[PDB]
Amino acid sequence: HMASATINLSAEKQVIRGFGGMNHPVWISDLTPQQRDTAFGNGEGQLGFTILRIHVDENRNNWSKEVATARRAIELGAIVSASPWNPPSNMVETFTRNGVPNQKRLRYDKYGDYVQHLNDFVAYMKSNGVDLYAISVQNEPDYAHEWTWWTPQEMLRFMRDYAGQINCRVMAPESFQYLKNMSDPILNDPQALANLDILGAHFYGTTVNNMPYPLFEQKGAGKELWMTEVYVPNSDSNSADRWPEALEVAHNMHNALVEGNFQAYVWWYIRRSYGPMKEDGTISKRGYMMAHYSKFVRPGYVRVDATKNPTYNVYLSACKNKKDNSVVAVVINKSTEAKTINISVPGTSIRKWERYVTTGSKNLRKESDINASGTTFQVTLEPQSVTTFV
Template identity: 65%
Template sequence: MTPRGDESAATRPGHTSRRSVLAAMGTLPVLVAAPSAARAAGTPSAAAAEVVVDPFAERQTIRGFGGMNHTAWIDDLTPAQRDTAFGDGEGQMGFSVLRIPVHENRADWSGEVATARRAVEHGATVIASPWNPPSHMVETFVRGDQTDARRLRHDMYGAYAQHLNEFHAFMRDNGVDLHAVSVQNEPDYAHDWTWWTPQEMIRFLRENAGSIGTRIIAPESFQYVKSFSDPILNDPQALANLDILGAHLYGTRYEDFPYPLFEEKGRGKELWMTEVYHPNSSDSADLWPQALEVGEHIHHALVDAEFQAYVWWYIRRSYGPMREDGRISKRGANMVHFSRFVRPGYVRVDATPRPRSGVYVSAYKGGGSEIVIVAVNKGSSPVSQPFTLGDGAASRVWSWVTDADRNLAPHGAAGVSNGSFTGALPARSVTTFVTG
């Protein structure tokens, strides 16, 4: 198999490497009674505009956070690493989505079972994406200056749907009921795998996707290219057989995250971000404060794009959420501030997203009256941040913080007075608050 483009030592002549399209993108108490109390204690803290959380202004339902396991390209997760990734206890990541490949060779299918089955035992959702159909279904063609480009033969669409269906049945028979399967991973960045045009994908969705026994994801554009997904949304027959519009965010600008056409045409469909690493695959995942880019990226994916799932590339990698030694990285800690506290079925609600420059806030409700707030402070100064909860039901708030010196450090509980509390956001940190 061809290795992933992000890990190749060289790039194919005549096309742009994935990396080149990526966007150039002191210990404090976390909770205080009021800004004046922080000043009295000698803690410098910049004032910020109030964050108003409105639990009645509901947005998207969150399906989960997770990552990829690909046993044909890197070693499988160990049993201990599976529990670290998908367990939701102290020292675990709380991932609730696992993405696996649909290998073109049936002999490779069994390699994905052990991790997928353990993820399911932890309550996770499993989705699958193919890179290539079986070789006898593929033909080569000339695409620009690529003389060996690959595509699915047009007389093999039915056979390919059966291939995907057989993978779904195989995983089900081995204890993994796939939540969804994709038509193709990155059909518009396929120098090392199989190309599809929007018209080809529309034809497959119209004529063949309905025969597959699980939900369908498409198109998984590498850069959320709307010109690839627009034709699907504008074709009622194709759209009828699409369940999840999947997208990748490699180098996608934040201003391109919103998708008005999906809001217009996608009623009854879901919107998932099914693969990314950010900001790059070259730096250590423990580099700080660069790892805070992950927290900001998730914020924009949930608030601006309104994705319902956020899925990293490899779960365990030097640039990933889990280090090669199985420990949670700084990038991973940013993810865990969402994944362990914002559980599947929680609903994002309105909250003031930018109370000051460099501070990003989002809020979610679930578990009865529980409200989860995640605040990223990219600034070099601590911030004393006031919060007001619209329903006034909370009486206590708990918090966890990650900064240069701490990873997901708990900070106990504090009272909520008349629906308000003030949280201290350390310089260059991410903090999760949970009310109760």
Template identity: 60%
Template sequence: MTLRRDESTAGGPESPSRRSVLAAMGALPLLAAAPPAAGASGTPAAAAAPAADVIVDPSAARQTIRGFGGMNHTVWISDLTPAQRDTAFGNGEGQLGFSVLRIPVHENRADWSREVATAKRAADHGATVIASPWNPPAHMTETFVRGNQTNARRLRHDMYGAYAQHLNDFSGFMADNGVNLYAISVQNEPDYAQDWTWWTPNEMIRFLRENAGSIGTKVIAPESFQYVKSFSDPILNDPQALANLDILGAHLYGTPPQNFPYPLFRERGAGKELWMTEVYHPNSSDSADLWPQALDVGEHIHRALVDAEFQAYVWWYIRRGYGPMREDGRISKRGACMAHFSKFVRPGYVRIDTAAIPQPNVYTSAYTGGDSKVIIVAVNKGASQVSQTFTLSNTTASSVSSWLTDAGRTLAPQGGITMSNRSFTGTLPARSVTTFVTG
């Protein structure tokens, strides 16, 4: 059947819809969920303890955060306008504060220049730019039979070296145009490639072993569409392949939270980064302003950072009816939920291990930016207003500011909060997300 990434027909061809395909696939087999590693703060909601103080100790450091952002794909939809670029990557009032831009490595070199303007402006704002290919150039591919698909596409096995050079050429082209890529992927979703290029784990391992070392920027793999561990486990278990991997990238389409933790990465991934490089959540069919559904984005980011310990969270299209920026260029409610993280938890900040679910329906995470600055993001998905006390230790913080998004307010600054003996109590309105900034 023909599937699309979203249901809109504007802007040209798009790739398949995870919302549709996951509903159709039903019980897709996934790696059995592993229990969180000792000391991990993420716990299932059913096991949440009664309301208690959230202890925030900056010395309890977890992962370094690289940033938050989204995708720009100018062949499938129109480019961001100059004003929209600033809304996405600026960090002033009415801006998202995104610090990561993902762009495609087009198979046709004639299309490369289409991605420059937005990438250059994002870089000017200090954003990290990464790139992912959907297909190699046509002359490097061949068709084969894969299950019921008779025209499945794969990279020819005698073209691995040429493909590595293709990725290098794209990186060089972007550098010549003022954009230094932070990293480049081997393949977007090699395990969900009905409409692009398939890779097996063994093919990915061979490329990483024999060819990825020649790539002049950081390398991302495998970007499984559903964080399928059976695709990334073999890489982690192969020292030669792992040596040429810099970022283990994954997508979270339909991945249940119990499958977010990755004990094998924690065991084998020393010196590597762990990024969530594409998702939309919870679907692509509803308006991004639907509330309280948009609050699901806040919980999803919380779980991606706390349960999975990802270092980056990257949305699909930046501007879309279901995305962080509406088609009119204004920030959506889903975008506001992202901005509660992206505007305040900046690249280089470190997540602090603290209570993840201090009371039912409340999700809290904390981050430090050094000195006395601590960021706390609290999502209240409950139907009632609650109070939550936060106690800071090993910090000289003495003041608190906060911003709120709920049904009627969007990233609205709130009145001052009194901190006494490095402790304060925040009011969390029903179905809301609040960011507290201490200093």
């Protein structure tokens, strides 16, 4: 016996929008000129990110701080999305939430004023060379101990009655854990849904069984699905090179793509001691896990149906470039054993497969090509490894 996986290039799933991370030049230091290139270029030694997330500061005097990094990302081919943490203080009021006093929410009489704030940010960025791809209603409205809370009902009212006035794609609701109670009302209201452009979600503590979303599959035509913030499996200091811990990053991305049908996967801080880029400006193990997807599965490629878990501890995803029907497969082997599988790609003309491998001891190493037996390809996966086949 040898386990088999089949990649079905005719069974198209979601179109990939891209991968990236956060810049926050108010809370932490901005990316440097070199770091911007390492993040958003796709050359040797670069992450290949194509999505930058930024924050919408409540104080407009901080907006200028975003511009250089956002513009450089765009020069390098990325798109930029922005999320607010709080409205300006003159729009906020306090309330008691589950017995905890002094919590913040948007005043019910300030929904229109909040639209204007968001539009002012969009306009400021446009005036300074940054055409935002999208703007969000609220970062983590359901985990707002340290920012602004929105109930599902409040979020729905905004999406239904106000968000059509926003001069940008609208992203919502960015639940901290992809809690469907925050998004169901939007999807179930035709006007709110019409005003939505991107269903955004974070993945903190989101289990695999909570990654599918039948209601979105039913109602989300013409809407994008983005995982707009996570770090996994922790934010421990100086953890970004830990192995085999870093394989959790690859596995989480596999799960987002295959179990969640996500079109985008966006880390928290790009440069951080637990992030994809270390403080010394070089790529971490966690960053190489991202790169196995980001450098190869380019915007516009389409995920296809493929045997997702062909043998225990082995996870496989595949995407296709519609321009030439070429294929990118990302295969994770979490076992301490080597694993040999057959990969069948019926109907492909491809016969030579290149492979790049990361383990605890090498990063995106180009290994020997594999020559196919017709439309089947036999591959031995090193222990505790990620391999991208192209």
